[PDB]
Write a protein that binds this ligand. Structure first.
Ligand SMILES: NC(=O)c1ccc[n+]([C@@H]2O[C@H](COP(=O)([O-])OP(=O)(O)OC[C@H]3O[C@@H](n4cnc5c(N)ncnc54)[C@H](O)[C@@H]3O)[C@@H](O)[C@H]2O)c1
Ligand SMILES: NC(=O)c1ccc[n+]([C@@H]2O[C@H](COP(=O)([O-])OP(=O)(O)OC[C@H]3O[C@@H](n4cnc5c(N)ncnc54)[C@H](O)[C@@H]3O)[C@@H](O)[C@H]2O)c1
Ligand SMILES: [Mg+2]
Ligand SMILES: [Mg+2]
Ligand SMILES: [Mg+2]
Ligand SMILES: [Mg+2]
Lengths: 345, 345
């Protein structure tokens, strides 16, 4: 495995270069803020929507996508994957300078052939293993999350150095940036989002629903299954030292005995078989067809699903718990500004 | 629901009083450190083992359990639940002063009748919804985790004020301290440890095993299922704003569409039915019998299970990942000392 940390990547390839962050959403905002705070010349390219004014409000040089690309040495395409094809064809390909680098943060558009190599220009993937807020929060703490990278086309011979320079400036090399094919990254990423994340929340919800049906205080039930932050803490501490190890070190003997009675015995074959089906639907292109269909609207069915989700007993109970119990939040005040808001006492 | 935050609980009931922390383990150490830093007079009562010298090393007045109880107004029994009966009968009951308060952090010993009310003395439960390290780390950040409390016996009329004074000093009232019966707390707590925690780790492991069997990079597979910290971050951010809400706010449209394709559809009836069985085994006293049997040895079978757990593919892969990727850790240097170690650069 090829893994780069801070000492394996220089900022020198970005000196006197301009990085165009295309999009100012979940990833675009975090990339833009970290690049700027790392002393990189950054511009934002964005369509005429709320994100354009947000980028301006947070002190960035903002223009349409075409002008940003045309005045950039490195272009980071940080907009939704189903929009890549149209923006690549219309905005990026006609304006990408000779010897410039285009990066995606997900391999989907590469697998589908919506983003393709261009003569005289570099193409790469730099895919964070983390969402926007934590990438920004970690960065401010001198930390970072891992990333996968893939050099798809290196026409200049500088593609790797520039990608790893972006990675260090955004903070991914503080954890590690591992070489992984865009195809494998695509399937990995989609599998986490389609099998693991839903199954994980479904499980928490099953815990809540059984407790409430059996007459347990709904606030207490919600708190134990995730609301307290304890299961989230176990998973984040587990990420560091191992999940079984967290229980061995911080579980009472009563907890450890209970845990190890059921550890490896809880799930039937049907869960493992569902994981295989999700993966086949991802690899076979069934999901890709489903996604394109959902993106045919402005994600109308997704909007309905999000709304319906919040009416579920678990999310009704959550609102009641979070109203009654204060949570240890890190204030988001000017998190993506050059200077953050005064600390909230 | 009766929930106390900082403004509903005074430190005044602890002024000129001594708190004996019995045990200096996962909970005992966090209680002792927070109480001291909150300006409470704290002593440690502990048997002649490694925890005794650790308490002394961290600057505490440490004696045997009998002497600590005898010189205390409030006694916190923070040792394993199966040891409560013998320590109550031998060390606590004969030495508990007139008008003194005994607190447990779990209702198990109360349900089993191993800890019982005593004439002229107060009995209560103050059960944190969090393990030791995070209680201490939250406290240092001016934060806290929730707790459940139950006044089992109030012979003085001061039991509630003293319990909630302990809760505020240790930091639980920064989130909220909710009245909940020791019995219900017992079953809730055991259910989280026996159904949810194992099922959660089993699920993560199922994700890892299917990916590795299907030819995915084992480091990448491990990172996606928890190793990156992303799923842990989703769960901890989810604790605050809701699990579905985290995906709605920080998920890409591709992620959100994938998530909502499978959300509420991933688990068969068998999982829900297993949750019911675990709960019946807890409520019926089957687990209690199993626990007493495991505690008959010095938890010998648990030691074997912990050792075996670390040899599993997931934990072998974890060691390889954590060697190759740096994780954003909060340094544990003198975390439980009056003054913490110099910040690790
Ligand atoms: N560990 C947690 O995260 C947690 C959370 C909530 C509730 N609790 C409750 O808190 C209590 C303490 O659990 P813990 O996890 O801190 O335990 P632990 O395993 O860390 O306990 C070790 C401590 O107990 C003492 N001890 C062990 N066996 C003893 C014995 N036979 N006689 C006397 N002292 C003995 C040791 O000297 C040491 O001080 C239990 O009632 C538990 O259910 C623990
Ligand atoms: N969100 C994450 O946590 C995350 C993590 C890793 C990878 N990624 C990848 O990063 C990329 C960005 O995802 P995101 O989550 O930041 O997205 P997002 O949903 O926040 O994207 C919103 C942004 O995209 C722009 N945009 C939306 N539709 C557009 C269109 N039709 N034409 C032009 N611009 C348009 C908006 O103007 C705004 O700037 C995707 O390739 C995604 O797969 C995201
Ligand atoms: Mg991802
Ligand atoms: Mg417990
Ligand atoms: Mg507990
Ligand atoms: Mg994704």
């Amino acid at each position: 495995d090829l893994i780069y940390q801070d000492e394996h990547a220089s900022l020198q390839p970005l000196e006197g270069r301009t990085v165009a962050v295309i999009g100012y959403g979940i990833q675009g905002r975090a990339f833009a803020a970290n690049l700027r705070d790392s002393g990189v010349a950054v511009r934002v390219g964005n369509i005429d929507d709320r994100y354009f004014e947000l980028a301006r409000a947070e002190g960035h040089r903002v223009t349409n996508i075409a002008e940003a690309v045309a005045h950039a040495d490195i272009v980071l395409l940080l907009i939704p994957d189903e929009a890549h094809g149209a923006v690549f064809d219309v905005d990026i390909a006609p304006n990408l300078r000779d010897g410039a680098l285009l990066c995606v943060a997900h391999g989907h558009s590469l697998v589908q052939g919506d983003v393709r190599p261009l003569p005289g220009r570099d193409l790469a993937m730099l895919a964070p293993r983390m969402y926007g807020d934590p990438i920004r929060r970690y960065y401010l703490a001198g930390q970072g999350a891992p990333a996968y990278f893939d050099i798809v086309a290196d026409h200049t011979g500088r593609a790797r150095d520039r990608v790893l320079a972006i990675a260090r400036a955004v903070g991914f090399t503080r954890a590690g940036v591992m070489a992984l094919g865009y195809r494998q990254e695509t399937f990995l990423d989609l599998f986490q989002e389609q099998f693991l994340a839903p199954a994980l929340v479904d499980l928490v919800e099953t815990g809540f629903q059984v407790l409430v049906e059996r007459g347990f205080n709904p606030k207490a039930a919600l708190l134990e299954v995730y609301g307290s932050g304890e299961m989230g803490k176990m998973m984040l501490d587990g990420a560091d030292i191992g999940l079984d190890e967290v229980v061995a070190l911080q579980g009472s003997p009563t907890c450890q005995v209970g845990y190890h009675r059921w550890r490896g015995r809880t799930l039937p074959t049907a869960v493992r078989e569902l994981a295989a089906r999700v993966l086949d639907q991802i690899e076979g292109g069934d999901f890709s067809a489903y996604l394109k269909e959902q993106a045919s609207n402005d994600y109308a069915s997704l909007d309905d699903a999000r709304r319906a989700a919040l009416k579920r007993p678990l999310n009704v109970a959550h609102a009641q718990v979070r109203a009654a119990f204060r949570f240890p939040t890190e204030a988001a005040g000017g998190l993506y500004q050059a200077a953050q808001a005064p600390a909230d006492v």
